[PDB]
């Protein structure tokens, strides 16, 4: 029932993990519009490194395109492609 | 080449998702300690409800206990049990 140390350590160590990101984090110019969904699932570097001096950073990136609805106040629904950055590989590097 | 609306929509909607969480976010009283790993994998509510006014909240929780190392550059290391809250169910609920 207790999770064993090495299992914890290996599962939390710096790697790309599916992360639910708010579209406004990625598209801050668009905060007065409404997106549906309002958040998207992306692969992003997460977890921790062996030292508080190191940070988990992307070493390979790519775009993903998704079909997202956007509506401006008092306009009709638009739908289209929106692109987001994904993290394919992560490493621990000095801050 | 393009992720379809419904696939994005379902995949990002409020649910419990593996989240990498820094131990100091959970145990802020303990910043006098170096933990290894410094972060832990926990099932936590995430994503979006698509309807500001609706919020993604835990509706069922449990605990999970993990072996964490606590170190001191002077002293020898200890391995101890630390308990964490997990989110078992999440729901979109009126704010």
């Amino acid at each position: 029932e207790v999770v064993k140390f090495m299992d914890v350590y290996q599962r939390s160590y710096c790697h790309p993990i599916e992360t639910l990101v708010d579209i406004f984090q990625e598209y801050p110019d668009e905060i007065e519009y409404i997106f549906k969904p309002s958040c998207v699932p992306l692969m992003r570097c997460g977890g921790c490194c062996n030292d508080e001096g190191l940070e988990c950073v992307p070493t390979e990136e790519s775009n993903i395109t998704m079909q997202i609805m956007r509506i401006k106040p008092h306009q009709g629904q638009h739908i289209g492609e929106m692109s987001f950055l994904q993290h394919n590989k992560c490493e621990c590097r000095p801050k | 080449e393009v992720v379809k609306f419904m696939d994005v929509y379902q995949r990002s909607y409020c649910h419990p998702i593996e989240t990498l969480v820094d131990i100091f976010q959970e145990y802020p009283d303990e910043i006098e300690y170096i933990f290894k790993p410094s972060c832990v994998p926990l099932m936590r509510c995430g994503g979006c409800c698509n309807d500001e006014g609706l919020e993604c909240v835990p509706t069922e929780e449990s605990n999970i206990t993990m072996q964490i190392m606590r170190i001191k550059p002077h002293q020898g290391q200890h391995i101890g049990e630390m308990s964490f809250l997990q989110h078992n169910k999440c729901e979109c609920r009126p704010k």
Binding site: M6, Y9, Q10, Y13, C14, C49, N50, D51, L54, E91, C92, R93 | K36, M69, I71, Q77
Partner: peptide, 15 residues
């Protein structure tokens, strides 16, 4: 062990 890479257990019992 290199602080930059994922450790095995002996990296930690050499701490």
């Amino acid at each position: 062990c290199d602080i930059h890479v994922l450790w095995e257990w002996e990296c930690f019992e050499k701490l």
